[PDB]
Amino acid sequence: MIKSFNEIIMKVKSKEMKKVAVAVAQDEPVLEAVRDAKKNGIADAILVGDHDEIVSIALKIGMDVNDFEIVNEPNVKKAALKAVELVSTGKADMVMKGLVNTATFLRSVLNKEVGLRTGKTMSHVAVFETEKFDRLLFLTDVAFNTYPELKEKIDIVNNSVKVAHAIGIENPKVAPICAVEVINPKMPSTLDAAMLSKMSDRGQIKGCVVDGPLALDIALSEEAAHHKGVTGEVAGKADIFLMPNIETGNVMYKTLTYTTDSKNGGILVGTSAPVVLTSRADSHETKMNSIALAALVAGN
Amino acid sequence: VPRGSHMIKSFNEIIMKVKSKEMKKVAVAVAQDEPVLEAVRDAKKNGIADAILVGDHDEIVSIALKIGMDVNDFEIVNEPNVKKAALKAVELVSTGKADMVMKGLVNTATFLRSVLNKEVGLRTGKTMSHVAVFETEKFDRLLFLTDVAFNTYPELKEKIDIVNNSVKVAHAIGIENPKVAPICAVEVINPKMPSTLDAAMLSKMSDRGQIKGCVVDGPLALDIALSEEAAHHKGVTGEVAGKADIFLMPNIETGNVMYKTLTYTTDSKNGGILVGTSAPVVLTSRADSHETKMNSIALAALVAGN
Amino acid sequence: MIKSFNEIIMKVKSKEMKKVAVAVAQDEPVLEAVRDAKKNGIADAILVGDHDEIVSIALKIGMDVNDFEIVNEPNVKKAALKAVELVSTGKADMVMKGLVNTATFLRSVLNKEVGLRTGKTMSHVAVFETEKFDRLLFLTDVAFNTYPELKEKIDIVNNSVKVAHAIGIENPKVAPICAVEVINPKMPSTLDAAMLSKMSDRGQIKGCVVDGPLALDIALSEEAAHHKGVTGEVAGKADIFLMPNIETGNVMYKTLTYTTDSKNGGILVGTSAPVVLTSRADSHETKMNSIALAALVAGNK
Amino acid sequence: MIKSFNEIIMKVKSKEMKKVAVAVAQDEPVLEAVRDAKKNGIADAILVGDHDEIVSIALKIGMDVNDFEIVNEPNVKKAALKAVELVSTGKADMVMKGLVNTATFLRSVLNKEVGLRTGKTMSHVAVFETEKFDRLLFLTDVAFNTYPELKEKIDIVNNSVKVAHAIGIENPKVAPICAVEVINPKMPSTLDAAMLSKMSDRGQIKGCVVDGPLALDIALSEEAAHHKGVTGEVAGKADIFLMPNIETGNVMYKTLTYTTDSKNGGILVGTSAPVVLTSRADSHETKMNSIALAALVAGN
């Protein structure tokens, strides 16, 4: 029954507040996000980085410095590792990449000594609110995992269904997206999709229904699914769109992002705690929606 | 034994359907074989099949006298040459002068090289497979087993035709919506077990109507395939678990052993044909009973009847 | 030059009408299209197939069959070979599909005896008019070529440049879309991108400018291009978007047509004459935009 | 010497009661079998599991809890280990499998510190008493080893003949089962088959005769072996049926039990002590006979 980033933010404000640890918090756009997140009751924050620069930027943007702890680390690589150390030892619920390149940030998340590393694979989950589809649309994996095979895709699916579970979708419909809705032994997408689908059928994957392969029209639309005579629980009702690799996943996200005015957020899951990872490309509202999601997950 | 919801569940039902229909014609490849001529006589007495006897006219007529078979009830074609006799029986079939082929006094390899002849043979381009049909005490349902005799190590391309050929036989028997279970060791996808991957991809093909006129659901272990009690205690649900009509084997070892076990450890009525050719092939054996010879004819006679 | 479908259709009305052959014309939705196409003044058409099942539908829909030619062929397959023939034998300027399934219709166009074979690969181009962008956007290949290699991708590009020429873009900006804008041996798409950019440079791909690999956003948006310090004739001004394969392709196509109100049309090129291959999936006005696209490419040549 | 499960059970009662160590005793079917084993004096038992849950089940079935020892361990994974520790350290003579997935039970039996680990490959031995045949047919491996090759098959055979020795078959007749009774380079199982038959001939595999390949029928039936004119000490009189892979052997196994009034039982060997890997779908009598086998073997 949860269909909008507004009902998402509302539910966040309804639960106990959560703490985010900013990795190199000298980022002005990130702190702008931490602030409007703190005042409206979405999330708290610990700022890890250069005390003097952080405090400078905070005055400029009218952000009470006395609202937040600030662990002073001038070194950028150490500032990142300390934000993750804060979360791995449960003094914080989430990490937000700050003024660090996504590579060094992701090494720290992955640190074998103090990181958030797990048994499962790490995966990105993007979420979208469209003018044209009343339910929420989740895309995994659009960012981190390049050419994942079955071993990875199982985990990529479990990680995304955890996120739909948090948003309140009890039993979400997972469509492995391919070019065609049909087993085709020259397209290994569809073979992975058949196998995930048997896996759901037998309870090796739980808390969802998986039915692929499915082209993107068959997964989105009832009219299209009927046009090509595809039946079952997922055609025209897909909550989760499992992308076959990064190339397809990235082109889909950016088509939505650059051709639509769709409210969207994204988080990294699979780790021991949710990770927020924005770019100067993401808007303040995306950054909001992103923290907003990372919160809901961490309270589940 | 709980009661099956099919129309046809036994070989007496199978043979009475054969008899409810226009007589089909069998080309016997090398007819100078008494157990096959015994079989072919009784086929004619009881209205199951007409036969053309292809081979050495002199010995066919001798053996006919020995078994009280009335040679006026049957066209004979004189080919004293064995290799050429098997080929002729096959050519008669491919040129629609008889509906099915039977092996007589020929070695299996020769007969088969004959059926697969490039010029006069029975090739269709899809793969040829053996379907075995059994009537067990313990299940009120015909069981179909594929491939138990021909395909040795089929991969997905072959299993798809082995499945479609299965469904054609079931349809001919009278099962319009058969239930097919790709048998493996387990009921779960295991990367270290190719059978199960193959089972998954056939199952999605069934679901999207790439395979038609059936429900394919696997992998399933044999116990979940037939027993509802086993399906139940193992939490396995769906249209095939406990109700499997067709048992697709992962290979000839699995098929052969299943089959040899049923024959030497039960008294289950059984019959077998080869299909996927342009016409059904009875490939009977010195080991099969007179009853098994007859059932085999009756199966072909139905595949051809469609 | 041209920046809208309204402009494509006006400019198509400028020229002399072009005949379309409908392979199995007994199709309500395609005949509603062929009809609208004649009243507006876009195309005349030969309606090949069952003369009786065609008139029943003609009457139903309110098109006097007198304004059209009819070639009676009651066989599905023969009507489609005959459709393709009326183009191949110079009597019509493009083929569009009807009741024939897609596979049979594609055997019919690529027929060796009377077909439209050119020896160069047959590619599908899709064309988009979006609110967020003023230039027409071209997506190849989205429909036909599944996993093209460098040699099939040269042709894919060359067909698309031919189409963009016919719209009035005399130098199309071609971006080999890829996950990243940097070269990556692990991503075969980036390799083919580099190799393709090189052939543009040496004037081995003529009449256009190819620069890849480019993430879609670098190719779409001047702002995205700038913020990642990627420059050149293409980045942020891309006209043709070269999809690395059909999975990436199919998904960018359906994401546009299901989440936006962008007008679009599609033709298959790399053939002697344009081919329109339309579907229940396609709207009525995208069937039109598609017919109009073929007529512009047929007319320019 | 011993030709029936009644005889197996007479020799078990004949000698001193041994103890099952049930891995997680909160299982009605397992306790129903452990109860009938105590009654008939086939074996004692230590039940390792959730004490409270154990007793209400012992109440539900007529099990007098005073006739068993209960080691209280609520944690399923730890209950599986304690069961094995009791065997490894000689307080019991077998493990049996309760409310655990097979993966968690086998890993516990294969434990490095406290396990029943050994030199030998673990192999399953099934054992049948059929109507049509006067001797016990033993099947190996129908359950544990998936795609064994020559090295594992040698251990599967040795393990196999060791069990036959305890039944009183002094010189058992091992048939490597294949589709055909002749060599064929395109059927790997026949290569392995003559491989193994040479090792018998050379005396490398001792205490048995090994002849193959043999089709199942040649091995079973004097008639079938006579008809295809196959001779030697094994054709027509095979005691042990060495299967080519789990798929083949599971299908013989499940065909035989769901299609016949055969009685059967099975244990895992190779380990330092017999194991009883029970199934959800095993009957009461199979679980019983299976305990009986484990007891008979632990008497050797």
Numbering used by the authors:
A (entry chain B), D (entry chain D): 1 to 300
B (entry chain C): -5 to 300
C (entry chain A): 1 to 301
Sentences from the paper on this structure:
The CaPTB monomer consists of two α/β domains, which can be divided into the N-terminal domain (ND, residue Met1–Arg117 and Ser272–Lys301) and the C-terminal domain (CD, residue Thr118–Thr271). The asymmetric unit contains eight CaPTB molecules forming an octamer. The octamer structure of the CaPTB consists of four dimers that are connected in a caterpillar track-like arrangement. The contacts for octamerization are mediated by hydrogen bonds and salt bridges between residues including Glu181–Arg202, Lys198–Asp211 and Asp211–Arg202. The hydrophobic interactions also heavily contribute to the octamerization using residues including Leu191, Ala194 and Met195, and these residues are located mainly in α7 of the C-terminal domains in each subunit. The CaPTB dimer is formed by hydrogen bonds and salt bridge of the loop of β13– β14 and helix α8 and α10 between C-terminal domains in subunits A–B, including Lys132–Asp261 and Asp217–Lys254. Instead, we observed four sulfate ions, which were added during the crystallization procedure, at the active site cleft formed between the two domains. The sulfate ions were stabilized by hydrogen bonds with the residues Lys254, Ser279, Ser283, Thr286, and Lys228. Because the structure of CaPTB is an apo form, whereas other compared structures are complexed form with the substrate, the structural difference at the α5 and α11 might indicate that PTB undergoes an open-close conformational change upon the substrate binding.
Phosphotransbutyrylase (phosphate butyryltransferase, PTB) plays a crucial role in butyrate metabolism by catalyzing the reversible conversion of butyryl-CoA into butyryl phosphate. During the acidogenic phase in C. acetobutylicum, phosphotransbutyrylase (PTB, E.C. 2.3.1.8) and butyrate kinase (BUK, E.C. 2.7.2.7) play crucial roles in the production of butyrate from butyryl-CoA. To understand the molecular mechanism of the butyrate biosynthesis of C. acetobutylicum, we determined the crystal structure of phosphotransbutyrylase from C. acetobutylicum (CaPTB, phosphate butyryltransferase) at a 2.9 Å resolution.
